[PDB]
Amino acid sequence: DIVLTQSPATLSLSPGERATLSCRASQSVSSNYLAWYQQKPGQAPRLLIYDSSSRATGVPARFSGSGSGTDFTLTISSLEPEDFAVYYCHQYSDISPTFGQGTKVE
């Protein structure tokens, strides 16, 4: 059962700065089937990145995903005020989907 561990738990940043988020899987993620979601307070999760590096339609270019195997990273090049939220990674490589515990960008 693949455990996803995000780090750091909290990132305190200002607008214009770079956010680098890390997701480490306990096992290799088959086909790099890893996704990133953004969730704002009181709202449903919203897809940012899937297939490790594919940016969903409508997602601004400042969001980019990378990595493979067990080490994945989400990068937000220039934080905007609307980017401060909690971010989850998600692997869908097997029949037992698992999520990271989230990284709060504050």
Binding site: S31, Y33, A35, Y37, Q43, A44, P45, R46, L47, Y50, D51, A56, H90, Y92
Partner: peptide, 19 residues
């Protein structure tokens, strides 16, 4: 509780209910 469409390699959970 959220309902969601699973798109696998073509978008994971790309559509979510509001919960």
């Amino acid at each position: 509780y959220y309902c969601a469409r699973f798109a696998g390699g073509w978008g994971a959970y790309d559509v979510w209910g509001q919960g």
